[PDB]
């Protein structure tokens with residue numbers, strides 16, 4: 001049995017990594033992720049300059065997941081570029097750098113600079129991504145960035161949008177992976193005891209993660225798995241156990257990202273997840289991920 | 300203490316009703332809803348003619364809710380119109396009729412015929428509602444239907460969409476209530492044991508209800524409560540307890556609809572829900588729903 005994944009000219013020991021934005025903002029966190037049992041890691045989505053993010057409380061853990069409105073607090077692009085160029089131990093595991101410019105020009109200017117470090121060191125872009133705007137953004141980035149990359153997608157909720165999104169992404173051969181999903185946007189948690197919301201920004205509205213999002217994540221993973229047969233899918237959303245991870249892979253996932261559960265448990269979670277996924281595979285008589293990836297049975 | 304609700308020229312004993320499509324398709328179901336402790340009921344979303352709906356299995360109960368792709372199985376408009384005109388006991392409680400024509404023309408034709416029964420008997424339309432398609436549908440109904448009505452909305456996931464939808468709805472004075480929300484669309488439930496989806500239509504993709512959708516429902520209730528101050532909001536999504544119902548009302552709900560939980564429990568649930576909501580209000584020292592409706596505290 002092996003959890004090995006091979007993609008983008010890399011070998012990964014297992015499919016697990018942190019979700020962008022979770023436990024990956026500081027040097028300490030990035031080193032902790034590298035030292036963990038994870039197959040890989042992705043750095044906090046960056047802007048050109050540092051951002052303090054939204055006022056606190058801006059994250060709340062919940063029985064069925066989490067809600068947040070972080071507001072992109074990050075050390076700025078130079079910091080994550082420097083980590084990738086100078087500090088990260090690529091001998092330990094591959095590295096993804098998440099990028100989230102507040103405009104198309106910001107993404108373009110960051111990608112111009114990332115190009116050389118991707119060439120020299122092998123860091124892989126995950127670009128945090130309105131369909132017209134989307135095509136134009138991908139065109140602008142592809143123009144200046146001479147490497148494969150992936151896109152982090154928000155969830156969609158109908159086949160019309162699955163089709164439209166997939167059509168655009170399929171126009172761009174450099175987009176070699178699609179990460180499904182980012183948070184279910186602008187949920188509103190109300191605490192019945194305090195009769196109030198639980199986070200401060202945006203009147204309590206924030207992105208939902210965890211158990212809430214698993215079926216939506218599976219839907220998006222599988223929808224894009226089917227519609228973009230030329231690309232890989234990275235799963236993200238609602239993974240707490242090796243069994244959840246099994247479901248991501250069955251739906252089509254190559255890599256499996258862990259957000260909410262990692263936030264609550266810390267990097268030791270990857271040790272648990274790898275052994276649980278192996279336990280699930282042994283019970284089901286699978287030896288490799290290739291054996292069941294995308295093989296979910298329809299009725 | 301009182302759960303009484305006064306709206307749309309009607310008095311309701313309590314805010315509870317079934318969600319459209321749940322336990323309201325047959326004569327026996329409609330009678331059972333009328334005989335229940337609920338404050339109102341709404342008939343199954345109808346098409347001009349009977350529809351068999353999608354192949355089975357097309358509904359599955361889940362630990363955190365439900366998934367379905369029913370495919371509008373219903374007895375047809377004549378049937379629900381005749382129930383409203385000839386059979387329903389308006390002395391027991393008010394009646395809503397849900398309409399879901401497969402085109403603009405179907406809605407126009409059904410509304411033209413509904414008009415007289417609404418006039419004579421007092422049945423209230425809930426119209427099951429692409430912002431252009433929405434504008435056109437509403438414009439057509441408003442043009443031909445000489446009464447106030449409400450709209451059943453899908454969930455939105457950002458402020459741009461909340462603003463755009465509210466803008467459209469505010470252009471129509473006849474829309475006097477907004478029901479938030481229909482299912483979270485096209486999730487995909489996978490059973491780890493069978494390595495398969497759990498419903499037959501549409502490769503296993505279907506609408507999510509129940510515990511999965513509560514924060515999204517609260518978000519939408521509150522978003523339209525804020526943006527459509529001229530209108531009533533009916534809450535729908537994730538109500539299993541009086542505490543859940545309390546949250547809907549706090550977010551801004553006037554009526555509270557119950558889908559998944561009712562499907563699982565049957566109409567006896569309304570007796571439990573009324574007593575639970577009264578118990579919540581008693582512990583919190585509330586006497587009426589007016590005392591806390593829409594009063595959720597932000598930070």
Ligand SMILES: Cc1cc2nc3c(=O)[nH]c(=O)nc-3n(C[C@H](O)[C@H](O)[C@H](O)COP(=O)(O)O)c2cc1C
Pocket residue numbers: 019020021022044045059066068070072098100128152181182183208209210211213236237238239257258259260261263
């Ligand atoms: C604390 C917090 C911060 C996040 N920051 C980012 C971000 O920087 N960029 C991004 O693409 N996603 C970010 N996400 C979304 C996650 O990457 C992930 O898509 C989401 O949490 C769903 O996964 P989960 O169910 O495992 O939590 C963040 C999520 C949370 C909980």
Ligand SMILES: Cc1cc2nc3c(=O)[nH]c(=O)nc-3n(C[C@H](O)[C@H](O)[C@H](O)COP(=O)(O)O)c2cc1C
Pocket residue numbers: 318319320321343344358365367369371397399427451480481482507508509510512535536537538556557558559560562
């Ligand atoms: C069995 C099934 C059938 C449904 N049929 C309809 C329908 O006829 N019209 C409609 O507007 N919503 C329909 N719905 C959506 C529900 O009215 C409701 O919006 C959704 O289930 C969320 O509420 P819940 O969490 O209480 O289940 C249906 C839901 C289910 C579970």
